[PDB]
Amino acid sequence: VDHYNVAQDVVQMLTKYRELQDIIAVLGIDELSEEDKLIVDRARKLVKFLSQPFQVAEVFTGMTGHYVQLDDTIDSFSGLLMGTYDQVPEMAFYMVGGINSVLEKAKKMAEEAAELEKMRRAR
């Protein structure tokens, strides 16, 4: 039942995202209400989060692949829909596997940007 509910919610959010795309490209992004803006952000994360690195492409693309178990998939998407991961950057979901990969890539991004600040603050 949880799998069905999550899948339907994702489909509903994606459909709403397409509708919101039409509006923002007509009236403007600022014209969306607070709820619509949150829906857009969550939907974009979902779209980025649906991409996965295949192990078959390790040689060509270099990046190590991921095999996401079903249990992880339901929890990872269920949490995103609720809004638990509303502070994670959008790009952390692009071509990553599982929720844990999202977090580790966030560490590597937050720590990476830390050096950039110390550089840009200095010099």
Partner: peptide, 30 residues
Amino acid sequence: EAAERNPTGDNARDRLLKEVLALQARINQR
């Protein structure tokens, strides 16, 4: 008022999520 008077895998995600966001606040500070 009475309510105030009275009072592992998922922990890793909460730990990482908290710690992940911990550096995101620190970078903003300095």
